[PDB]
């Protein structure tokens, strides 16, 4: 419908230029100040508020609410493209995946979703009144909805694979597999050109150390 290339630049303009006053009328860029923390790995979750987006583009709010998942991906891409602009410090590596990414970067100097350690969420606009579970009908499929309910069952936090990282035994190269679906096919044989042209028969070993996991939790909500 819309040109997502132009929409990404609109999202960049919002994230760069929006400002709000918090204290004594002083002006702060609430999303630039958080992009700085995201770049420094001080903050991981960025809750972007569509009430803030409504202050300069209600049409963008309508587009986000009506096609939310697409715009969630667009906002994530825009934030990742923006963080190098806000880099001003070196990260203290504390995750083993930070250490692996550090050595990956050094070896590349000598996977965007893999380099992406942040997560972006839409905080819903107040114009969207909260529904009950029974009112979340098929017309709202693929759309941003607010739902009230009783939590009645919550699973343990489980590791959900996001980017599976493999290593080849023959050629010593890393292979990456982004995972969108709830299921995926593991990679067996190395697809690298060095193995393929030589018919080397080198296979792939998953490296959980190098792969990206995310906390995952299922729950059940119930009507009041």
């Amino acid at each position: 419908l819309k040109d997502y290339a132009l929409e990404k630049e609109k999202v960049k303009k919002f994230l760069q230029e929006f400002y709000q006053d918090d204290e004594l009328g002083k002006k702060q860029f609430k999303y630039g100040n958080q992009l700085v923390r995201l770049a420094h790995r001080e903050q991981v979750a960025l809750y972007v508020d569509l009430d803030d987006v409504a202050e300069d583009d209600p049409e963008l709010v309508d587009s986000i609410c009506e096609n939310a998942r697409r715009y969630a991906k667009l906002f994530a891409d825009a934030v990742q493209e923006l963080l190098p602009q806000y880099k001003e410090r070196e990260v203290v590596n504390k995750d083993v995946l930070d250490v692996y990414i550090e050595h990956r970067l050094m070896m590349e100097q000598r996977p965007a979703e893999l380099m992406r350690r942040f997560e972006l969420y839409f905080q819903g606009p107040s114009s969207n009144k909260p529904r009950v579970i029974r009112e979340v009908r098929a017309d709202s499929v693929g759309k941003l909805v607010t739902v009230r309910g009783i939590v009645t069952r919550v699973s343990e936090v489980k590791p959900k694979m996001v980017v599976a990282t493999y290593t080849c035994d023959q050629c010593g190269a890393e292979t990456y597999q982004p995972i969108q679906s709830p299921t995926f096919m593991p990679l067996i044989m190395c697809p690298s050109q060095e193995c393929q042209t030589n018919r080397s028969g080198g296979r792939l070993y998953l490296q959980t150390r190098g792969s990206r996991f995310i906390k995952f939790q299922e729950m059940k909500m119930q009507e009041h």
Binding site: T167, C168, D169, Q170, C171, G172, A173, S192, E194, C195, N198, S200, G201, G202, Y205, Q207
Partner: protein
């Protein structure tokens, strides 16, 4: 092929047949036919009989047969059993050292910095630290099918020590 799996010091069908010849005394008739000047016409026949009789035997091994062989062969069998067992135990210990004392799904990966891979990147090793003492690149490779033309020739039969009675009879013959 089914019943050639007889173990040594046992009476095969050929051994029983030779014993039948011995007890019937046709062996002495074959000696007569071989020594006779008048019946020289059957020399090729008698030669073929003797050849097929001594088909399985070895001359020095047969010539070594005698009265005191049972104790010798019994002790030799026990000693050879122990030698085989010790060899198998040694090989088992070497394999147990070559693999680690952790189960195979115990993970861990290493970069061998000096070794270039088939590409320019350093070798990533996955088969456990224990294997890097005697590392070789052919640890996980399947050997090759020798094509039919290049398949080496194999010896047509195993040697088995025939029955002692038949061996004594063949020595005397």
């Amino acid at each position: 092929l089914d019943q050639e799996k007889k173990i040594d010091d046992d009476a095969s069908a050929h051994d029983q047949l030779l014993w039948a010849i011995h007890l019937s005394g046709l062996d002495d008739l074959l000696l007569f036919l071989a020594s006779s000047s008048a019946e020289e016409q059957w020399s090729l026949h008698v030669l073929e009989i003797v050849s097929l009789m001594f088909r399985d035997q070895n001359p020095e091994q047969l010539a070594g047969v005698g009265q005191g062989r049972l104790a010798q062969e019994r002790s030799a069998d026990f000693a050879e059993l122990e030698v085989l067992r010790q060899r198998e135990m040694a090989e088992k210990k070497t394999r147990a050292l070559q693999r680690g004392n952790r189960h195979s799904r115990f993970g861990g990966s290493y970069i061998v910095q000096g070794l270039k891979s088939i590409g320019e990147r350093d070798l990533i090793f996955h088969k456990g630290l224990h294997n890097l003492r005697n590392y070789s690149s052919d640890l996980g490779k399947q050997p090759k099918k020798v094509p039919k033309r290049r398949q080496a020739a194999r010896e047509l039969s195993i040697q088995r020590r025939s029955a002692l009675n038949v061996r004594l009879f063949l020595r005397d013959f």
